[PDB]
Amino acid sequence: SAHIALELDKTKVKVGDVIVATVKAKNMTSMAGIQVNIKYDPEVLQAIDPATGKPFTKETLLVDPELLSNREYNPLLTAVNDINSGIINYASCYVYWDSYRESGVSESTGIIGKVGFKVLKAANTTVKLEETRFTPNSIDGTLVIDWYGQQIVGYKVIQPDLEHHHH
Amino acid sequence: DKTTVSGYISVDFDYPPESESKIKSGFNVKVAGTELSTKTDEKGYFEISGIPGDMREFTLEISKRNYLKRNVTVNGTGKLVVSTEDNPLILWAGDVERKGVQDNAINMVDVMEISKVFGTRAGDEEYVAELDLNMDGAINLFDIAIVIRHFNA
Ligand SMILES: [Ca+2]
Ligand SMILES: [Ca+2]
């Protein structure tokens, strides 16, 4: 029924290619916050802004968030990426849950955010939503809270295709 | 004849079962206007004896680092039980100690202090061990959610 998905726009690549990764939510009823962890091989892929090419560093947020962006509910966005371990670690959370609940309307389906990946090396690799040191006791490195601050569980996590070198 | 007061203290958020003993222990409980105090054990249990028998009305001051402090009034004499293991007195995490000092309010100030230490771990310059509120080995969305849950004093 519900899921968090990681999508790649391209999976068969040559060196110099830029892969766009998109994190999406589906049927995530009452969601007021989310944390996602994207694990990649930093030797093979470089995390970049998919429009400017600027490399991600520790504080860099996922680009173009759709869900959890209502100004009236006081969105709190943060990232503590570990670029050397190849981890993107992003969290976004509303602070005014009472205003959000009163609306009755759930940010259940839409884009969490995006990150690009520049291909550095001609090698088969994987980009996955995956538990890291940032996210113990998680759902495949995803943490979701509802508008009462309780963990949302029971959803699936959808992984993109493994990445292959164009030979 | 002296008065003894006992009870249980707990929390309202989820945590890993292995942290239970650390989460439930170390709540300070003090009889206001006296030096009669104690700390809760691994089950959240506390007991204080030797309260003057003539002291028929007293206040229990309950506190812990990063928790909203709580005053509970007690009326009675003898063996008194203020709460039970099934219906414990709840303290709210999220009144963050800032340079040694809490302000008795759960606020955006508290939220930002957690946000400051998001993603930090032992050995990091900024890491604060007791801001891992649910004691799961990470400071992340769940620790922020605990503060917002309690988002006022
Ligand atoms: Ca405070
Ligand atoms: Ca934690």
Author numbering:
A (entry chain A): 3 to 169
B (entry chain B): 7 to 159
The authors write:
The CipB type-II Doc (residues 99–164) formed two loop-helix F-hand motifs separated by a 23-residue linker that also forms a small helix. Both F-hand motif loops coordinated a calcium ion in a typical octahedral geometry. In the CtCohScaC2-XDocCipB complex the X-module stabilized both Doc calcium binding loops, while in the ScaA Coh-XDoc complex the X-module only interacted with the first calcium-binding loop of the Doc. Similar to what was observed in the CtCohScaF-XDocScaA complex, both helices of CipB Doc interacted with the planar surface of the ScaC2 Coh comprising β-strands 8-3-6-5. Similar to what was observed in the CtCohScaF-XDocScaA complex, the C-terminal helix (helix 3) of CipB Doc dominated Coh recognition. In addition, the CohScaC2-XDocCipB interacting region is predominantly hydrophobic.
In addition, cellulosomes are central elements for the production of readily available sugars in the gastrointestinal tract of a variety of mammals. It is now well established that a wide array of highly ordered protein-protein interactions involving dockerin and cohesin modules (defined herein as Doc and Coh, respectively) mediate both cellulosome assembly and cellulosome cell-surface attachment. Primary scaffoldins, in addition to containing multiple type-I Cohs, have a divergent type-II Doc that binds to type-II Cohs located in cell-surface anchoring scaffoldins, providing a mechanism to tether the cellulosome to the bacterial cell envelope. In addition to ScaA, inspection of C. thermocellum genome revealed the presence of an ORF (Cthe_1806) encoding a protein comprising 2177 amino acids and containing a putative type-II Doc, which was termed CipB. Type-II Docs of primary scaffoldins ScaA and CipB in C. thermocellum possess two distinct Coh-binding surfaces that recognize different Coh partners.
